[PDB]
Subunit: 314 residues, 3 copies
């Protein structure tokens, strides 16, 4: 199978500059080379150049609407393109608002896809419920069919078409949900495993249930959108919104290993790695290294080890 890396060095979805450096840090750490050592064919599409929209006045509270909307329209085109040729898209993030274009483009080719969202946050604030106008905390609002027309149209997002329904998404790692977002997920009946369900069930049973929930009836392509703050700050400190009590390095790897095993991974996002937020170089190294490890895991690297087929090592 073929893999195509797409860098999305974008940061206007939130106030902290730095996430745009995310793709560079991950490549610097050898992500592309290490992926070529796996059984997959890898092609690096490079980083997308995003045109800045001058005079991007805020829409009510929403900041940089046009710049975010345009960068995402462009990313959706690119992803739809690689998906069309039958390759697996891997988006290297800047902030999580880029999931709008990544999932939109992916859905144009695979309308029946399901989403596994690993994050400490639901990122489902609508333009009306946000306390901040930050779009990195609103991606899912723009993608849900059930949320269509529940918020005013935003400048730069008219090209977006709600592609997935509440039944096609599963959250894992939740521990920082605003009152409004909580209201939304409860009202829409969205399946989720907050840190309390992970604690109660154990990550092994959590994965069992998300698969029987999303793939029980029909086997369909999987889009894994992975926000690095889903893991505890001890493992991924270099992020914009760290929340204590998260997933461990082990649980994160367990999630990716199980997803690899389904044979259905179709799209992947590695978001919110911000190199400038590390208090010490080691903190940045720690964050980048685990992001790389999670990516390699999604493509076959197992902790029990790997050996090339047909090679008699004796």
């Amino acid at each position: 199978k073929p893999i195509e890396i797409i860098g999305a060095p974008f940061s206007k979805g939130c106030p902290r500059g730095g996430v745009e450096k995310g793709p560079a840090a991950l490549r610097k750490a050898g992500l592309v080379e290490k992926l070529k050592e796996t059984e997959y064919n890898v092609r690096d599409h490079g980083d997308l150049a995003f045109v800045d929209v001058p005079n991007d006045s805020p829409f009510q509270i929403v900041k940089n609407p046009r710049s975010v909307g345009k960068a995402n329209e462009q990313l959706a085109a690119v992803v739809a393109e690689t998906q069309k040729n039958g390759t697996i898209s891997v988006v290297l993030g800047g902030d999580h608002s880029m999931a709008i274009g990544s999932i939109s483009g992916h859905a144009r080719v695979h309308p029946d896809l399901a989403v596994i969202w690993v994050d400490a946050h639901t990122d489902i604030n609508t333009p009306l419920t946000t306390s901040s106008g930050n779009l990195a905390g609103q991606p899912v609002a723009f993608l849900l069919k059930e949320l269509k027309g529940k918020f005013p149209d935003v400048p730069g997002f008219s090209w977006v078409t709600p592609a997935i329904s509440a039944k096609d998404i599963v959250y894992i790692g939740l521990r920082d949900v605003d009152p409004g977002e909580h209201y939304i997920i409860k009202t829409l009946g969205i399946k989720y495993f907050s840190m309390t369900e992970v604690d109660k069930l154990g990550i092994g049973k959590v994965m069992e249930e998300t698969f029987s929930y999303l793939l029980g009836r029909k086997k369909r392509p999987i889009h894994l959108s992975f926000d690095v703050d889903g893991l505890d700050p001890v493992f991924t400190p270099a992020t914009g919104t760290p929340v204590v009590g998260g997933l461990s390095y082990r649980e994160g790897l367990y999630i990716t290993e199980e997803i690899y095993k389904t044979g259905l991974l179709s799209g992947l996002d590695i978001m919110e790695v911000n190199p400038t937020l590390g208090k010490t170089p080691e903190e940045v190294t720690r964050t980048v290294n685990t992001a790389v490890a999670l990516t390699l895991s999604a493509f076959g690297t197992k902790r029990e080890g790997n050996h090339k087929p047909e090679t008699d090592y004796l």
Copy 2:
């Protein structure tokens, strides 16, 4: 329901000064204000002023018997008072010996209560088995009916009446038990979940079983006495007796979330937070923040999020 915060800035139960500053550190962190944001009515009773008993000679090995006994008699009066008015008492600790007064006063109003003791220690040394005369390590000995008359009467504790039996207490987090204490809990048949049972069963099943054990027959008020050293030193380093290999931040929260869900929480103790034992300011901040988080969790704050009823956020 109503909540009444009662500060017990007391430290004579152990040799390390500093735990008396516990209540102040917790209030400083906004504990009271954060509690008012929950669905509960909060009333801060302030800190109790404890009269120091001059010439408090040790009783054999037991140190400061009269001062500890008197401070606890006074606390028991206060707690009995608030319990009588039907409010939930929350004692902010200095050392764990204050559980004597806290549980005694609580039992006067709710004689059928059950106790969930979260601690790395059993704190059940009798005045005869202690290696040190420290009373913070003997609370439970004074409260058990089955231990009545098994140790000489101590100066200052004649007002105490053993209120609970071995059948009404469950320990969680044990990992540092003296030979004598171990002998006692085995002989008396006290239910406990040491770190090895937590490791074996997972915190989810541990809570299931402590509830079926204490509430299986009759639903009764629950008193949760929480020693902050029950959690691993990595989360609560600012305590007098830290022991490695404890409960994680996540498991601690899981415990409080489950207790909140029973709807039976009646009394709560947040003990052993000693601000002067942090090696760095951050260590104190870390300890205070998790103590606050545990308290809020006992009163409804969920990791999956919270939203106010009747408020249509759309």
Copy 3:
């Protein structure tokens, strides 16, 4: 029962000097004295003096073959000796290549023994598959019957006789396996629990299954070879090859407590503690303390506590 401590201050099995100081650091921490407090009879055999083989040229890639082979022949003699007298051998390590002599000598007296290998590594590289000539990463290759004649005879190891088969060993904690090693364990059908199986099953079920697999048919002596890097670097940082995402302090203790409970522990290795690799004195202290705790746990120390029989503490 009797315990005999045997120090193996050896480091030629790997490039990083320092592991030879392992035994001294462990004794310095009071290992021997603390063991005497248990129900066992303890005898310290002291440290073995290893004769250095001059002009030890490398065998192809393999470094210090003769020195490693000789030190192991000597250790095997000593262990066979103590095993013969019916005592439990406890080898305090330098590097893991010493498991060759420890297990070989043990098997001379107890041919039906089974091995529980706790390590982040399989240490099963053959002289032909190693990327480095380091012997600490090849112990198991020399011990497996199924690997006999699959690699050239090495200078200094002609005295070795493959004592155990693929059916008698179980790995726990794997997370860093070379392609060749992975090929070997898959081809030979060796039972293992990598960190992913520990994540999926939980340490409780992992122990259940390793016991039903190794002791289901016949109860036999157990040899526990414990590489300290099996635990996460946060608990045992002072080792030569730390790998993130390992067993926790709690899981490590759970393993030893369950092994103690079988009543079948016959041989124990505490390997790879390297005092010179701690970045701070506290890191070395942390590493030595958990190694001591694991050893005491193998011989009865429980987290729920211990009390001496026939002693009425009341």
